[PDB]
Design a binder for this molecule. Sequence first.
Ligand SMILES: Cc1ccccc1-c1cccc2c(CCCOc3cccc4ccccc34)c(C(=O)O)n(CCN3CCOCC3)c12
Length: 155
Amino acid sequence: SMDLYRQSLEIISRYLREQATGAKDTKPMGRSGATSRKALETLRRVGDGVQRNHETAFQGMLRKLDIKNEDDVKSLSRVMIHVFSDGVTNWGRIVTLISFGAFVAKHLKTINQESCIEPLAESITDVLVRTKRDWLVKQRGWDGFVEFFHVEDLE
Ligand SMILES: Cc1ccccc1-c1cccc2c(CCCOc3cccc4ccccc34)c(C(=O)O)n(CCN3CCOCC3)c12
């Protein structure tokens, strides 16, 4: 889906870019902006927690990947599908994919590979929308993501 890819890329690239730079993007959101803004807010809350709680595993995975240049970033796509396409599909695994994406984006800045952040964001969005299309549609896309992590109103 064109609209699902577009919205997912906007959310994912905004999170990875602001995690690496330390500064939010003031540029307005495109189509379905209200959902995208709520999704980015949820991603910041949940995603920052995932990076803190799974720091040892994220450091371990980053070391195994041994990312040194732009060719290594292009090959990340096949490692992503090997790990992500094996087993169950849920929002927890999706937030892990994106959160590790931000952890990798920060490392990319450190090694002067900031130009690889946007192709990284596109690769993550590609793996997500291409492999989990049907599941994402059944779960109401990004509205479903926001609702899933919304627990303060359970009573
Ligand atoms: C949290 C955890 C705990 C214990 C060990 C590893 C992890 C762990 C670490 C990192 C990411 C994930 C994912 C996201 C998908 C891969 O993301 C990428 C892979 C490769 C490159 C990527 C690049 C950019 C963005 C995502 C990339 C999952 C997941 O799919 O849940 N896990 C758990 C992995 N399981 C462990 C048991 O063995 C079965 C697999 C991950």
